[PDB]
Structure formats: structure tokens, C-alpha cells
Amino acid sequence: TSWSDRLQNAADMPANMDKHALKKYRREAYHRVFVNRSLAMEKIKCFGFNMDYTLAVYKSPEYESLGFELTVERLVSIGYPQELLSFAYDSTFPTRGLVFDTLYGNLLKVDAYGNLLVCAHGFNFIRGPETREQYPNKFIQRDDTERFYILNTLFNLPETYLLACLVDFFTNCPRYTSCETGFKDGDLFMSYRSMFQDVRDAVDWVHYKGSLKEKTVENLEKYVVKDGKLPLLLSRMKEVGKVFLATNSDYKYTDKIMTYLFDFPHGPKPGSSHRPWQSYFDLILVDARKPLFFGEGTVLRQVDTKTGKLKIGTYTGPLQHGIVYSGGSSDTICDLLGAKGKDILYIGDHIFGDILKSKKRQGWRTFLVIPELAQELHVWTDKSSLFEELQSLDIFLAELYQRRIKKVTHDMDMCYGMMGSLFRSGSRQTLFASQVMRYADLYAASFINLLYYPFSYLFRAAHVLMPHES
Amino acid sequence: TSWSDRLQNAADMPANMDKHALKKYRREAYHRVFVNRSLAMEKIKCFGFNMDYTLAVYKSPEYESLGFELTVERLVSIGYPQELLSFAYDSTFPTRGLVFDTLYGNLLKVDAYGNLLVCAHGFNFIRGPETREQYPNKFIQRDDTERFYILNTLFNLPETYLLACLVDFFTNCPRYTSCETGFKDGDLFMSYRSMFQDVRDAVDWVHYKGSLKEKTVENLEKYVVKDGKLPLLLSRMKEVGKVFLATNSDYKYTDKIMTYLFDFPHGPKPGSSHRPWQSYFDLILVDARKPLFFGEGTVLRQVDTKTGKLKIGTYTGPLQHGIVYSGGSSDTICDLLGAKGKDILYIGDHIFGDILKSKKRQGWRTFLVIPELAQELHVWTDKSSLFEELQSLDIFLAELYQRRIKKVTHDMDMCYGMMGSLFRSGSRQTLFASQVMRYADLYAASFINLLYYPFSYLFRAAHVLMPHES
Amino acid sequence: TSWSDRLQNAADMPANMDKHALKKYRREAYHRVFVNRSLAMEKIKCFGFNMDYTLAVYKSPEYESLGFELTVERLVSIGYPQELLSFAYDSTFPTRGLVFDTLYGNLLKVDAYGNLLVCAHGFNFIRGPETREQYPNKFIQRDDTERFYILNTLFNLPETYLLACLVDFFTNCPRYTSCETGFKDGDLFMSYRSMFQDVRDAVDWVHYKGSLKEKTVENLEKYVVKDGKLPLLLSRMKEVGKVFLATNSDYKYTDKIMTYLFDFPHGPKPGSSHRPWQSYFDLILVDARKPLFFGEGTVLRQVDTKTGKLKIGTYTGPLQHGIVYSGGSSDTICDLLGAKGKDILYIGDHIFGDILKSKKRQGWRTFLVIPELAQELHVWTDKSSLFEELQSLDIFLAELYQRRIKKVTHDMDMCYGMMGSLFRSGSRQTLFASQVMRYADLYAASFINLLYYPFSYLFRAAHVLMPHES
Amino acid sequence: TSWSDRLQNAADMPANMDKHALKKYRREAYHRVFVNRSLAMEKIKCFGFNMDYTLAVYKSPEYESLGFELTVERLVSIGYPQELLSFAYDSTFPTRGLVFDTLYGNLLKVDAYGNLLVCAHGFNFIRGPETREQYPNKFIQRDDTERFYILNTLFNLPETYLLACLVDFFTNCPRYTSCETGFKDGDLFMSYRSMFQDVRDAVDWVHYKGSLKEKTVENLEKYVVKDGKLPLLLSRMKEVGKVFLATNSDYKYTDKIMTYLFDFPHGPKPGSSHRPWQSYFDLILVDARKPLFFGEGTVLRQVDTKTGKLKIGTYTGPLQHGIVYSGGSSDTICDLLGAKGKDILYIGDHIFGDILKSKKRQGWRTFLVIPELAQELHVWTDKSSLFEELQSLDIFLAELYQRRIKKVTHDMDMCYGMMGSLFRSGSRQTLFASQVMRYADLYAASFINLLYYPFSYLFRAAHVLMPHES
Numbered sequence A, B, C, D: 001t002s003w004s005d006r007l008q009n010a011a012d013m014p015a016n017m018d019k020h021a022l023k024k025y026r027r028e029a030y031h032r033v034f035v036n037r038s039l040a041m042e043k044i045k046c047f048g049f050n051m052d053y054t055l056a057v058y059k060s061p062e063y064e065s066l067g068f069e070l071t072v073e074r075l076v077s078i079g080y081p082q083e084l085l086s087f088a089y090d091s092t093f094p095t096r097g098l099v100f101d102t103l104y105g106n107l108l109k110v111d112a113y114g115n116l117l118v119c120a121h122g123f124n125f126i127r128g129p130e131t132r133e134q135y136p137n138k139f140i141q142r143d144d145t146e147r148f149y150i151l152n153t154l155f156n157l158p159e160t161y162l163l164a165c166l167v168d169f170f171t172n173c174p175r176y177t178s179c180e181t182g183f184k185d186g187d188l189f190m191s192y193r194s195m196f197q198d199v200r201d202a203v204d205w206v207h208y209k210g211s212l213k214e215k216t217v218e219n220l221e222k223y224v225v226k227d228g229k230l231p232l233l234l235s236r237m238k239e240v241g242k243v244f245l246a247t248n249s250d251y252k253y254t255d256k257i258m259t260y261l262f263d264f265p266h267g268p269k270p271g272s273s274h275r276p277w278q279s280y281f282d283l284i285l286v287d288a289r290k291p292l293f294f295g296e297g298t299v300l301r302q303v304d305t306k307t308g309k310l311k312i313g314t315y316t317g318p319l320q321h322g323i324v325y326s327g328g329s330s331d332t333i334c335d336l337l338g339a340k341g342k343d344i345l346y347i348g349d350h351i352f353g354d355i356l357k358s359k360k361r362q363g364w365r366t367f368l369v370i371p372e373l374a375q376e377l378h379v380w381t382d383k384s385s386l387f388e389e390l391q392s393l394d395i396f397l398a399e400l401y402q403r404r405i406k407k408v409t410h411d412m413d414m415c416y417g418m419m420g421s422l423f424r425s426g427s428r429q430t431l432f433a434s435q436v437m438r439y440a441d442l443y444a445a446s447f448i449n450l451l452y453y454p455f456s457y458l459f460r461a462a463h464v465l466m467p468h469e470s
Helices: A003-012 A019-027 A062-077 A082-086 A154-172 A192-208 A212-217 A230-240 A251-261 A330-337 A351-362 A373-382 A384-400 A403-414 A431-439 A447-452 B003-012 B019-027 B062-077 B082-086 B154-172 B192-208 B212-217 B230-240 B251-261 B330-337 B351-362 B373-382 B384-400 B403-414 B431-439 B447-452 C003-012 C019-027 C062-077 C082-086 C154-172 C192-208 C212-217 C230-240 C251-261 C330-337 C351-362 C373-382 C384-400 C403-414 C431-439 C447-452 D003-012 D019-027 D062-077 D082-086 D154-172 D192-208 D212-217 D230-240 D251-261 D330-337 D351-362 D373-382 D384-400 D403-414 D431-439 D447-452
Strands: A046-049 A099-101 A106-110 A116-121 A148-150 A182-185 A188-191 A242-246 A283-286 A300-303 A324-327 A344-348 A365-369 A442-444 B046-049 B099-101 B106-110 B116-121 B148-150 B182-185 B188-191 B242-246 B283-286 B300-303 B324-327 B344-348 B365-369 B442-444 C046-049 C099-101 C106-110 C116-121 C148-150 C182-185 C188-191 C242-246 C283-286 C300-303 C324-327 C344-348 C365-369 C442-444 D046-049 D099-101 D106-110 D116-121 D148-150 D182-185 D188-191 D242-246 D283-286 D300-303 D324-327 D344-348 D365-369 D442-444
Touching (some): A046 A330, A062 A154, A062 A192, A154 A192, A182 A192, A188 A192, A212 A251, A230 A242, A283 A330, A344 A351, A351 A365, A351 A431, A373 A384, A384 A403, A442 A447, B003 B373, B019 B447, B062 B154, B106 B154, B154 B192, B182 B192, B212 B251, B230 B242, B283 B330, B330 B351, B344 B351, B351 B365, B365 B447, B384 B403, C003 C373, C062 C212, C154 C192, C192 C212, C230 C242, C283 C330, C330 C351, C344 C351, C351 C431, C365 C431, C373 C384, D003 D373, D046 D330, D062 D082, D116 D154, D154 D192, D182 D192, D188 D192, D192 D212, D230 D447, D283 D330, D330 D351, D351 D431, D365 D431, D365 D447, D373 D384, D384 D403
Parallel strands (some): A046 A242, A046 A344, B046 B242, B344 B365, B365 B442, C283 C324, C365 C442, D046 D242, D242 D283, D283 D324, D365 D442
Antiparallel strands (some): A099 A106, A099 A148, B099 B106, B106 B116, B182 B188, B300 B324, C099 C106, C099 C148, C106 C116, C300 C324, D099 D148, D300 D324
């Protein structure tokens, strides 16, 4: 059972809007909105969205597998060996948020301070003592972006696995000689860094010049989660505030995806007339170029929605019904909707490009969608005894002042996959977990969970106290 | 009672090293080491220090007042009006960590997300609604370093007050006209930005080209806390590991200050022969140029300790007894002492230049000295009823779903000073508080508090859990 | 008669290698090599080439017209108005080397010091006094590359004309309102800057993603000058030194073009066996990325000449017969051929990317091919009386110490085209002329003119003397 | 006889303003203005000046010797060996415009293309073949400013000699070991680069924090050329246009120097009342910060001329009689004087900071003062037979197509000094010579030579023709 199976199962259910059913429903972890900092929903005057993996949740593992296949085919097309075609995407290997070390060709899972939690070279998981030869302090400087790439998005899941496939392949292929920083093939040397750049370039190519979008829109039922409760929630948001879309995707792709997401024989509720997707938004903005969007952005353009092309010129006019914007900046939203940052709840899946930057640069309120939580929540509750034992071993070890702690850690971790939970390895939290807590005011497996809370709900989190204040 | 009075009172006490007395002593908040992340002292192989406001704690308010006076005299010397000479330093006004907005000339106290907690123009404290005219989202982007300067160090305390004095003076002086971004005087316009740059330059000048150091060393009993337990703690650290100094100050000043700090008729304990301060250190490094020190640093030089001048050339040799280094980088320490980052406990007062950068860039373990805590702890415990009432009002307000919450907030805040606690305004934590929790593994009013813990103590902090994990 | 007609006429002639015929032939300006700084051909050990507009001289105006048409079609494809399709390339308008001012939308012809010689807005030529409203000092700062784009290459000829077509079109189209920095169309504003960026992007697109290369190689006799004396000259160079190619183009395109350039039923001379084009080169390098090539360049790769794709890895081996390189740097050439810079005569058409940078950054000897000189030489000799009169009027005016000087200037200039000679307006030299003299050691309408000089010819230029030295 | 002896000898002569005497006087090379590009003096509406080495010509070798001594004393003060005190400035060694190679510790004389003309390591002049070991192409990339420093100003003359003294000293001192890039002294390594940085820093220190200015103004008759014809020429300029000063020096130093330069018992002519120096200027600007001045500059300030300190605030008012400005930009001059660039003749000694930048960035007309020409002109005319022979040998060698050419070159060069003429080595022009021709419209040994030309003189230079145009 993948996380998108869970999401689709919940998506197939109709909305029972009886108040008692809602309060009962939101009590379950799977339909709950989790709270890092308190948020009074009554103060939210605008609800903003991105599209990919928020409104349009791509089904797993089918969509990752499609991206993987097209990326592999692109690398073979530009000269990588034919054996790449025998790879097959494996969803049990990658966890989101790993760091690829382009110097030594390792995938690393790290905590918020750069400490190594897991290190894998190809499919070989390197134990603590052996990692010290390359990482003397079992530590990396995350900000060295020339060396380290953080695979933070769900679009990065296929290349996370592909990097490991490639390192495994070249390590074990007799044509090549393994070296510390790459592979030697006579008079040719392929560094892990150039290999990584080829993979990155190929992933980009597949999304923007290849056939990924075409293959997606020709079979949207296979590739995109669909929920009849989406127009109900958006119609309810529009009753109490304004609603906007700000996506990096272009208008033609947005229109195809959004049309599918709203393709029901009804509108907000069963029995109601169908309405076009654009009617649910007070402001539609494509080609957003986030995260630059939250700084100076780009010039504001207007989409000719008949042709899908940009009109000639910078758009200088006002908000008009039916207009579609392109580029601009977050100040465009605030100006055209008459909003301040804390009036806005921005709902997205990119922990950096959506959530971190809108929080840090503009003081927007933030809702992080984490699709994998729809399944991680099931593992967490089902194996709570593993974690509880780990807590007790940690307390026992501290007051006593080992191999049992590592074994339980491994067993707990493997329930999530070969690279463990998105949020921790054993008792140690990941960088990703830390960023969620620090920058996502609210988070959930799906933003649909807002449907189960009344219009003026007060999301509450306990106040933080310093050690000397307790 | 200032925080340095508290520190000096504790410094005057002799060390009772009976184990039961120590454990009793460390139980009191004033002599406790507070723990943000767990740290096993047995794993620490090197203890590192800065000098200023860590080993050499400058007495308050005398030292700030000296800096203030010399800075004022410098501004008058370069052409500011004579009325500046009538200013007098007032320790009740500044709290450390405020942000000066060079655009509108305000001092701001902010939380970790840039939200305004306090706004003062000169000595006028601007209430919430009036702040929205200049801060529509009651929010600043901290990283806009061209506009905002964060007064993060104890050396910034005099200029924090001076900026407010100057804004007050020009606002109320009839020769000038107040404008949004500065002051008009006929054909001259002084922006808050250029005023701020003059103040910054004058503070720098006083420390490096003026008479501040000379005036300090000619009366060290007036200006520097002195503790006979300092050589005892350092001798104990040297029994179980290595000890190093890395200061931004030059050798001549370091030698004068450190000689005074060790000027007792005894060594580590009463009755023992006096030892020169250098003998307590395995590695002495001056002109450190932190925070650049934790990146590429500067070329490693050797101090001629006879003359106080640098020897000619880059030093290429090994660690030698009696050598004093200059410049270099944090890698110098690790190489010469055979240490890895997590082997090092680095003890400092600069939340950014010492603690943040050594943690983020090198994975060092960190101990933050917060001198003002020596007194903030007394206010916190004495007025705990104010805070407890505030907590209850917050809980009452949330479940009820105001003016009483603001009044209690003001009354609690004013016990610390006109700019409130270093760590909070009412129930809202400051940016400084957040950075302490995030980057200081341990913290205390003085590093001397390590004296009261056994050699292999395990400092413990509770594990963090995400909302969905609770 | 275009300059490529002249070049093709000379190209059709067979080589008479009798010494007396050669010396007679090189006496004519059209077959002469012109000399800015003395160069002893005996000291040249390597001859290097670019391909486009040096070996492969594209026929005029057919090739510019093709580029113009495809660029227009691309702009219409992305949303520019249909009326663009009625434009038709006009070779009499553009002169190479003009500056487009993106602020005011003017094409400018300037001297070496940025002084305005000609200013045209659309097709309106602005007289001196009217230019002062926008150019108060009749001067531009060339280095302000955010504002000014210098149309320095022959590939820039179509967009030079297109920019003027577009400014003319929008100025006179009733849908738009003309403003100082662009065109208003209700709520849309198109600045000259964004218009220029669209044109630049479309030209790039046509060359690298569009059909320009495909259309070129499907009719090479229409689009490319062909000269049976090319393999003769290259074979003669290989007798006395090494020969290399360094082109920005990719291998597949290079192979198609070079195969055509050598497609004769003979080799170096009539009667000799045909040889493949690669055999004429000791070193072949594609994807050169000049001018970055003359700095750090890019990593050295090897082309798989069977597939046209790059082999995997950085190439670390030696120079090998038959290998084709990709990327690298100018140091690659020097290392693999055992050359120093002054051993190299580098032959190219890009006054900046080829000639300036190889001279300034590496001290290479330089030969600049200027295709338009093949026709400018005919205008210069035929209308020498116009220029001679201008010289006399200048001398008369100086010793006398006007309208006649401007009229003669205009009449002389118009013989070259609407934008005058590449090298001057009247008696004032262009920036381009100055750069040729400063950075091209030798120059000619075609590098084929080297065929008419003996192996150890000494090209001589008179020494320069300062005013006080004369 | 130094060049300042020549200048002072001419300065002592009274002005005979009879028209026939003037025309006779300007015929002599020593009193002539030399012309690179034609300039109609009638079109000049503003005459601008710098102060140092233009209005205030420092006497040679006394002033260089003072700078040398203070720089040496500063290096010894910071820890260089005592033997430095035995150095003594030698004016016969340095020629202006040499390049110090911080990698290999050589002084280089180069032509405009970076070709090596002379190479000296310490006082050892390295012959051609031996230079190829470090300079394989006998070529340097001038723009590599991290490696090469061009000693372009007269203030650089002492450090030019000092760098050679130091390289000589350490090479031959037995305490040190000579290495390719510096000197080893056991565990200390002094690279030529760090040595050079010490020298540069010490020269800066002497000018701005040391006693150079104090020592200069306490004996101005020893250190500064004085000419009673200076106020006559400036009064004549003010009759036909405006006159401004723009100096990098501060007001207190400018006032002392300018007061001395005008300290005669008369004003413009003998018999006339003395006038204060400020009265000769329509605009006085100090702290100019050229060359940044010709870009965005700094904020415009006003000097309080009573105190010598800056008034508080940016100056926003108009040009007022008696006001003295500080900072600003070249646009300040143009705005306040109502000038365009080609209305301005800017007179200076810094070939880069004055002349190149005002020409390239603003299109100002330029007059370069070259003090050494006052003596180089005498060597040039007296040894014209050497140069004439060299020309003939060059022509003979070319048509013949050696050791005699090198011997004559050496003999000619040595008449100027150990580093030859500022303008050439033998028949090869220096970079400096090339920059003079390219950027100085007019040049002379002194700007006083303008006194000998009528108000509306037309300076004329022959037009430049390309090779194919001749």
C-alpha cells in the first residue's frame, strides 16, 4: 500500500458535513491537520495553492516509475551504456530528502546539524566506523551546494534511486575501475560529480523538453489522484476568503491537469452544476518561478487563454475576472488581493521553494502537504511498540551511565523502506523533520483535511520554553 | 544589581570541591549548565574558548558606559553637535539582540520569524496599530542586511542606546525637520542609514584606533570580572583533554587581559604556585578573524611573543610548546590538536560568530555564555507569578474562543528593562532565544558552572517529537 | 554584387602557383593580406581555424534572409502579430557592429570612444541636434552591457535589420502608443528592452532548437561558399606546421559542413586523390565554447565519431590520430600540439570571441577574416575621389579656422548601405575598425589570401611613434 | 638633472605674453602640448584638475626618497629585519609602469599586448632565453590582477624600487633559502605575494596614517614645485570657461598644498593683488574617490572649511560661492557647472584613475600630465642618433630576410635608467605609451604649456587610416 493508495481511498469517500461526523473524522491521524505553531483560521483572508503534489497528487509508484524510465532513456540516448535499460524503479529504496555527495558518490541521510544517519554507496549501506574514512567527523556542511545536492522534492524520488543504480552499476561493471571520486575507463574518467550533473540535466530535460507531461496527460486516471471533495473545500474557502493558484507550471499543462481534477458530473457538491476549474480562483498565476517569486520575481505577464501563449508586454492593469497571470512576484498576489502576508495561508509541497521561502521572505502562514505521511502514519501507529522500546532503551542507557539500540533502530527503520522514515532514523530526527517543524505552521498528508474543521477553528500548539524557563 | 555584580559575587566564592556540595550547588539555577541537546562530557577531548565576555567578562554598566562615552566623543570629534556630550549611558534601556531599521530609524525586537514584538522610535514606544503604517505585515525580512542591523553582541549594547539617543535628539532639536527616512537641516539631509553608519564606524574606531583598550587595561579591577576559580576549572579541563584559546583580539591586548585574569598569589588552587596564563593552554591563537575563521580563515602566522609583532612568513611548522599563533582557521585547531569537531566543546559569547558558525560549518559542540542570564534568572524566578498568570490567560483566551494579556505582558517585560527580556516579550520568544536553543548545545550565565559537574557527566535533554508523533 | 559573390568568383578560379603569378596576384587589394603588426610567417608553427564565416562562408544575402525568416516565424509562433510575416530581409540596411540601445530603441553606429556617428529609430535617421535630447553628450558608455548590445557578428545581421523593422512597425501601428522606452497597448507595455530580449532569444532558438541548420545542410550550394583552393592551402600549411580546428558548433553539423567544403573529385590539387576533411587537421575540437575557451574553458571530452555523441567521461589521454575533442580550453591546444601562443596563427571571424580574446588572454597571433571587405574594397577604390575630397575639406576647414563636409560624408556613406561602411562614417573610424587595428595582427576578406604568399613571408607594418617622438 | 629640476627651471621663468614669443616658445618640445586626437580649445567650457603631480608636482628624487624611507621604517616597525634600514632610494632604477609578478617576484616591463620587454629579479636582469622558464610565451595576462600589480603612478616609484631591494636582500641573505615563489626561513615561508602585500599596505599606511603628509607640508620648498605662472594660466582659463578641482586628497591637505602653490606677493600677474587659491575655482571637490567617482561615486557632502570636517548630512543644495564639496560623482560636476563631457578638459596625472576612466566612462576630453617627459624629452633629442640607427637596423634586417640591434637597444635604454624609457624599450612601445596614445587627447610634461597657446587654438592630429585604406 503506497501513500497515494491511501490518499485515493480517502478521496473516493463522499463528504459527510454533519458537524459531529466531521469532529469524529478529524480525530483520526489520517484526516488530521497537525500544528507546529498556533493559527486562527478566522484571520486567514486568502488561501493559496501550488498545483503539483498538492492539488495534483501524482500516483505512486506509477508516476515515479514513468519519470525514472524516461530519465534512463534520455541518458542512454546521450551515450550511457545500454545496460541502464535493465534498471527498474523500486519505490522501497528511496526516501525523500537524502543528500547526494558528488565527491564520493554517496547518498546520505542527515539530521538538522549535518550529522550522518545513513550512508549508502550504490546499494551498499556503510556502517559507522567505515564512514569515518570519508567523513572524519560523521558530518557534512549542507550549505556547500557545489558538493552536496539535497533531494528534497517528490520529483527527486526517481533520480534518488537512479543515482544509486548508476553507482552500483559502474562499481560492478568490469569495464570500469572504481576510484575514490569516480570511475576510470581507460583514457576516460567519469567523476560522480559529472555523473550527477548528467542525471540532473536528464531529469530536467524529461520534464521540460521530453515526453513526461505528454505521457501524463494522456492517461490521467493512471497518474493523478482525483477527489470529488476538492471543489467542495475550495468553494468553502471562497465563502470566507479569496483563493489563488501560483504554480511553476505553464498554462497549457495547468489547464489540462486542473480540468481533469474538476472533471465530475457535478460542482462543489453532488447534484450541483459543474463549474470550470478557473471559477474556483480569484487569482490564477502560472510560470511563477518560485522560489525567486518570493523575492524580486519576474515581470508580470498576461496569458492569452485562447492560445496558451503570453500576450505581448508587461501587464500593468488591475485584477480582472477571467485574466490569467504569468510570472510576477508574491507582491503581485498581495497587491491584487489586498492581502498582507499573515492574511495568507499558502499550501504547498516544496519544503524549500514553497514553505521555507514564503515564511522567511514574506511572513506568510504555511501549510505543508506531505504525501508520504498518508502511509508513514500507518507505519508509525502500527509499529509504535518498536519506537516505545527505543525510547526506553535510550532512557535506560542514559541512567545506566547499545547493540540492542542499533538493532531496534534498524528494525524500526526498515518498516519505512531501505532509507527509513522521512522524519527520523530511530530516535534521531532528519533535517527534513526539523524543517517541517520550523517552517510549516500546519502540515498534513493532504490539504483536504482542512475540510473537516469549522470556518473559525483555532489550531493550537503548546508554547516553547527554554531549558532555564522550565 | 547588574548581571556582572551577580557574576562577581559568585566569582568571589572559593571552590568547595566536595562532591555533595557540588551536586547541591549545580542544582541552583544560577550555577547550573542548561541543556538544549544531550552532551556526554566524556567524549569531549578539547575545550576551546574565546576571551571577550567569556573569560574576560567586562563589568556592567561601567564598561558599556566607557564605550558609550568614547563613541560619543568620537562622533563629536568628527562633526556631530555638542549636545551629544550631554547624553549619559543608561543600562535600563537596551536589551541585546534588537534590530536597527536603517530605513525608518526604529529599534525592533523580533521573534524568530521576523514578527515585531516591540518597536521604538527614539524613546517613543510605538503601539501595534501605529507600527502597521511602516510595517504593514508587522514583519521584517531579517536577511535584508542592507536595511537591518542586528545588535547581537554585548559590545553592541552602547550603540543600541546611542542610536535611540540620537533619533530622540534630532527629532526634538528645533534646528532639524523630521522626515520619514531621516532629518533635514536646510540643504543637508541626514538619513537614518548614514547616521547608523557613522555610529557603527565610531564604535569600530573606538575599539581599534581609539582609547578603549588603553582605558580598560589601566583600570582592570573596575572593568573586568575576576574569579580565582578560573585556573582551577582550566587545570581540571587540561587533566582530561586539551585546552585552546581562539580570540579575535591581538596578542598584546590578550596578554594584558589574561595576565590580569590569572593574577592571584596562587595557581589552580590556593596554596599552589602561580603559573603564567599561557601554561593553561595547549594552543593559543589570536587575530582569529571569526567567523571567517570557520571557513577558509587567513594564513597561519606566528607571534613573536617578545615583541608582540608577527614573525615574517606563513608558519608551516608543528605545534610547539610556547608558540603563539595568529590567524589560521578552525582546521588549524583540529589538525594541531588531532581533534574532530564533535571532540571539541567551544565556549563563547557570540551567538553568531562563535556558536552558530562553529556548529553549522564544522559540527563543533557548543557552550554559549550569556552574561545577562546571571540577572535574568533572578527576575524570572522572582516574577514567575506574572508569567504563570500570562500562561493561564493564554489558555483561557484560547478555550473561550485581551487587554489583560497586554497589561501583564507589559508589567512582566518592564522588570527586565525598557526593551524586555533578552529571551521573550511576554509569551513570545525572541529571535535570540530561538538561536540559543537551535545552536547552543549547552548554555549558562558563566562557563565557570562546568566546575560543578563531574568529569564524565552526561548532560541530557528530552528528545523532540513532531506533532504527528505525539 | 554582394561580398559573397566576390568571394565565390575568386573561389571559382584555380590556383596558379607560379611564383610570379602569385606575387602579381597578392598585389591586388582583393587578394591581399593586410598587416596591422609585423608577423614572420616562418615563426608560425600552428595554424588554427574556426569554421563559421571563416572556412564556411555563408552566402549573402540568402543566408541572412533565411535566418531572418525563421526568426520572424519564431516570434510570430510565440505571439507577436501576424504583420511580422510581411517583413522581408533587406541587405542594404544593416551594417555589422551597430549598437542597439535597449532603453530608447535606437540602432547606433559609434566610434572607438562611444561617440555617436549615426542614430536610427526604426528607419528614421536622427540628425545630430535631435540626438542630443536622448544623448546629451552624443556619447554612450559601451560597457553598460545591461543597456547596450553590440551586434558584432555576421549572425547578428538579420536581427540588426529585424530590430529596426519591429521599432518601425510598432511606431506606425495604430493599435500601439509610442512612449520613450517602449510601446503601450492598453494594459500591456512592451519596452524596447523586452522586445530586444525576445529577438535575441528567437535568434538563439533558430540556431540551436529551430530548423536553420537543417535548412542549411539540405541546400549547401545555395548557402555556403565553396573553394577548391581550400584543401590546397591547408595541405601547404600542414607541410610547414600543424593545423587545428576549434569551433563552437557540434560535431554532426561540423561534419556535414566540412564534408561539403571538401567535396571535390580531387584532394589538395586537381588530379590528386580525394581525402576526408579530418585528414587536413592535426587536432579537431568542437563545442569549443569560445570565448570561455580562452579562460578556464570546460572539461575535455571525446566525440564518438560513429554516433556523433560524447563518450562518457573526461578525456585524460594523449593526442591520437582520428580522435575528435569537445570542450576543453586553449591550453588543450597548446599542450597537445606542443605550442606556445606566439607559435599559433589563429584565423577567425569573431572580432571579440575569436580575435580579441585569443590575443588578450593568450598572446596568440591573429588573422581576422572580414567577409564584407571583399565588397567594401570595391566601393573604397571606386569612390576614392569622395574620400579624397573629404580629406581636403577637413584640411581646408582646419586651416581656415561644413555643410559640404556633411553632404560628402552622406554621399560616401550611402555607397556602402544605409548604415555606411563597416569601418567608418566619413572621416571618423568606427569602433569595429579600431578593434580590427588593435587586435587583428593580419586581416583579409578571406584567409585563402595566405595561399599567395611564400612559406617564410615577413608581413611588415610600420612602427608606431608617439607625437613627441616624431 | 631630474625631471622636476627641468620643471622648476621653467617654472622660475616669468611669462612673456607677447604673441610672437608665445608661438616661438610653444615650438620647443619642452613647452609644447602634444596631440593624439584633435581638440578645438574653443569648444572647451570647463577646465578640471586633480592636485597631486598635476598642480602640486612633487620634487624628484627628494619626495620619492621620503616616501621610500617612511615605507621602509614602517616595514621595520611591523617586524621586517633591521637591514632594511640600510637601503637608500635610487632614482636611476625605477621606471614608472612596471608590473610586479607576485608569483615569481619579478618586475616586468611589457608592451600593450603583455609581451615581456624587460624582466628583473631583484637587481638581476634576466635575458630572453632564461625568462622562458617562468614565462613560456614571454607573455603575461595583464588582467590577472590577483597575480600582477601595475605600478602606474608616480606614488608607486618608491615601492617599485623597494620591491627590487627586498627581493635582492632576501635572495642574498644567508638566513633565508630562495624558492620559486618566495623565501623559506625554517618553519616560516614568505611568498613574494605576501611580501608585496606588506609593501602595498605600508605605502598606503605612510600616506594616510603615517607622517608623509606632515613631513611634506613642513618643508614645501624642498618637496613641491612652485610656479608663479600657475595663477596666470588659471585666471586665463576662468576668462573663457569654468574651472574645477577634483582631488582624492582631503580638504586640510589640499588647503595647505594649494595655499603654498599660490603663495606669491602677487595674484595672476606680478603687480596684481594676491587672491586666495579657492577664488580660482568655480567648483572645489575633495575626497573624490576616483576612479569610482566616474561611476556611481559616493554621497555628496559639504566641507566645513572653518574646521576641515564634513558637515552632517548629504548636501542637496545648489552650487554656492565659497562652498567646498566632498565625494559626489562626475555627474555632480556636470550638473553644477551645466556641462557635458565633451565640454570638459580634464587635466590629470593618473593614466588610469584620471584619464582612462573619464574618457571611457564619461567621454570627457583629457590632458595627461607626464612629469618625467620634462627630462625624457632631453634624452630623446640628445640621443636621437641611437634611435635613428635602431630604425635603420630594423629596416635593414627586414629586407635582408641582430646582436647589433640588441646592443643599440641596451645602450639607448640605459640613457633613461636601468628600466629604460617610460615609453619604450628600443623600438618596442610600452603598455604605458599605448595607453597615453589611446586615452590622452593631449599630453605634456606640464599643463602649464597650455599658457602658450591662444584662447581658440585648434590642436590637430593626423587622421588614422587602416592598412587597406592606404
